[PDB]
Design a protein around this ligand. Sequence first.
Ligand SMILES: *CC(=O)Nc1cc(NC(=O)C*)cc(NC(=O)C*)c1
Lengths: 245, 13
Amino acid sequence: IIGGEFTTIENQPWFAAIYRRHRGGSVTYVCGGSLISPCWVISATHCFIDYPKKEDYIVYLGRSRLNSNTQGEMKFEVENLILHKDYSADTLAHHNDIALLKIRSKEGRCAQPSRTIQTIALPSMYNDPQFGTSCEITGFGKEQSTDYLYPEQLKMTVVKLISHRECQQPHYYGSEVTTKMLCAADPQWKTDSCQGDSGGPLVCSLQGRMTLTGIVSWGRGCALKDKPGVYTRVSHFLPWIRSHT
Amino acid sequence: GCQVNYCPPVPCL
Ligand SMILES: *CC(=O)Nc1cc(NC(=O)C*)cc(NC(=O)C*)c1
């Protein structure tokens, strides 16, 4: 996350931190995700498409820090990793960039909700937030495009939804954005998602309820003039989600 | 490598 603030998992209790174990045992951070039911985390397919072996993945819930522990955190294996069959990408845009991870504890259980571990409500295709709405993005991604390392602590910021009509202009993203994607950015282009934030939640408040509106997917850069963050539009994948969960 | 990213790689500082 470029700009914004550090946060704690109490402020985003659906946030899932996804890591991968390598051959020799070293574990690296992959991507964010969101808990949508006790057994299911939703994320982005591009996070896993090069390494789709489920056994290598580690999912944490209730975790506020990258390499230190948070009391009440819970660790999971991935029982099923489901990538979208029609995922595609060019050198910039990701299409159908959505993935499901069925999570399972060492003890064979799904998540137990707590103060720091909670599901987030799925959106409805009838209840879109209007352009100009402010939404929250969260993740462990780079604080600058030029940073080699990720931050040691979760961050969050606020961005505003941008209309499809506007995002499709040649000087924004033209034909690279579709109606299955949402654009969002800072009006002054100083806060944004970045590398490492993929798979994480774009959350908007609808009728007072925190709702999973987007999944961090791609951008030309991070906090870059006329180049918004682009998010998978969750309300346009409800059948896919229900079929697989 | 860095063929799959959120956004095209930027040289590190
Ligand atoms: C694989 C990898 O290292 N990717 C990577 C992507 C970005 N993208 C943007 O900032 C848009 C930046 C970096 N920067 C550094 O590693 C310094 C790496």
